[PDB]
Ligand SMILES: O=C1CN(Cc2ccc(F)c(F)c2)C(=O)N1c1cncc(Br)c1
């Protein structure tokens with residue numbers, strides 16, 4: 145028993161991290177097979193920041209303008225291309241530590257592990273969720289761009305996030321590994337702001353199921369709710385709508401605990417009305433929304 | 446910006462984890478140089494576990510009773526011996542992935558990363574603190590025994606914890622890598638309980654400094670206090686005493702943020718007496734005590 149924010153073991157990703165330098169700019173890149181992926185903004189100067197024309201900046205570069213260092217070894221860049229907001233540098237060595245991997249684009253509410261890196265070297269690993277407003281609440285300093293986000297269900301690494309920037313509210317924006325941004329953001333220093341964030345309702349319900357599995361029942365009640373009445377109340381507390389898909393997804397947790405999804409919804413309504421009255425759930429005094437249904441089943445039993 | 450419960454990258458430890466089977470028991474072991482370390486209770490059946498005589502159980506075993514698998518490869522056990530509550534299985538091959546490492550024993554309040562493993566396969570990594578009552582609030586299922594805890598101090602892995610058991614309250618107990626238990630526990634099936642726990646004061650102060658560095662400042666106030674008056678309050682709220690050494694250790698954070706430790710102690714006094722009045726700090730409604738001063742400086746400064 146116990147319940148913890150748990151990340152995937154980071155070793156398979158650690159063996160893929162490299163340092164990419166262009167001009168006076170250094171950041172991180174991801175070395176898979178014979179390609180290094182990194183944010184295209186590595187090619188920008190101080191001037192360039194507001195309205196960079198990336199195609200024009202890139203056409204001016206040769207292979208030998210990109211320095212790639214993997215530990216103590218320089219790799220040779222033998223080709224370059226841009227895909228959306230990522231640069232792909234072809235190198236003359238396949239990474240001998242390349243894991244089985246794929247690139248997956250995730251939806252808001254999905255969680256993943258982040259391996260924070262500086263100068264091509266790993267600093268730490270933690271868990272994040274894609275917020276409804278397409279940001280992530282990470283922990284990143286100057287030099288962290290190119291850090292990646294991943295899951296490892298089975299032996300296969302699913303890369304889902306590459307870090308590009310910090311927004312003024314201190315939250316983080318980035319792309320999938322095909323270089324498409326999550327949300328409306330762009331890799332330019334013009335004014336942009338995250339929309340107001342909301343709580344991930346399906347995840348809170350998952351976590352309440354986790355609390356029951358681990359032996360806590362104090363917050364249950366004798367009531368039920370319709371899906372529509374639940375959503376009418378929940379939205380007054382800045383909770384995302386719960387959909388019939390989400391209800392279906394919670395089916396297994398419902399069957400394991402004997403508590404119907406809409407009865408758990410009624411418990412959540414009361415928690416929003418009353419607060420916790422000095423109590424905690426799984427060691428928290430707030431409702432947690434960064435565990436998915438899949439996360440709960442994997443960690444519990 | 447941002448502040449997260451962050452574990453060390455786990456790769457150097459992942460390359461040392463193996464599966465150990467003895468009879469119908471499978472659990473995890475740590476393969477360093479030519480030795481596999483695991484809990485000595487691997488040799489017990491249920492009946493044995495009620496009142497084990499480990500020396501007597503072990504003398505009945507041959508090397509070939511211990512099946513050790515590193516991935517899909519069997520290792521050959523060529524020797525077996527016990528040190529306190531850990532079994533050491535000598536094997537015929539040195540681990541080519543052995544990192545630079547040391548075995549260290551940690552103090553209550555200190556934090557470490559846990560690599561939870563099942564059947565010799567790492568499943569997850571998270572950060573823990575050794576509680577003042579010598580338990581850890583981990584997340585472990587059947588099969589997790591032999592999972593380890595560690596810090597990384599340079600390129601050197603400092604192993605500090607090996608998992609042995611779950612207590613009835615759902616917290617966790619184990620040993621250092623020399624097989625000495627943290628806390629007043631034994632490796633047998635009898636009634637055992639965690640003692641009453643306390644809050645790690647120096648760590649809460651560290652986390653308040655983390656909050657200030659990240660822009661969360663509402664709890665600061667004009668007041669200061671003395672160590673003696675603060676410690677009277679801590680005692681009343683089941684907080685560990687704050688020592689002068691703790692004050693010294695927070696020195697850097699005090700100079701960086703302009704908030705003296707005893708000035709921050711006056712903030713913490715008020716929080717204990719009055720609560721948070723609906724507010725949060727770094728997204729929490731509780732005072733967090735599982736970041737050390739070193740953890741905070743490392744995460745707010747970028748060490749790699
Ligand atoms: O290291 C950097 C650089 N940067 C700025 C940036 C400039 C032009 C662009 F087109 C763009 F996408 C991003 C930025 O936000 N970081 C950062 C990333 N994470 C946490 C911190 Br603190 C800083």
Ligand SMILES: O=C1CN(Cc2ccc(F)c(F)c2)C(=O)N1c1cncc(Br)c1
Nearest residue numbers: 145486585586587588610611632633634
């Ligand atoms: O997997 C096991 C086996 N086990 C047996 C045991 C009982 C008493 C002892 F003194 C002892 F040394 C071993 C035990 O506690 N776990 C466990 C460890 N962590 C989280 C879970 Br759930 C289970």
Ligand code: NA
Nearest residue numbers: 666668708711
């Ligand atoms: Na003060």
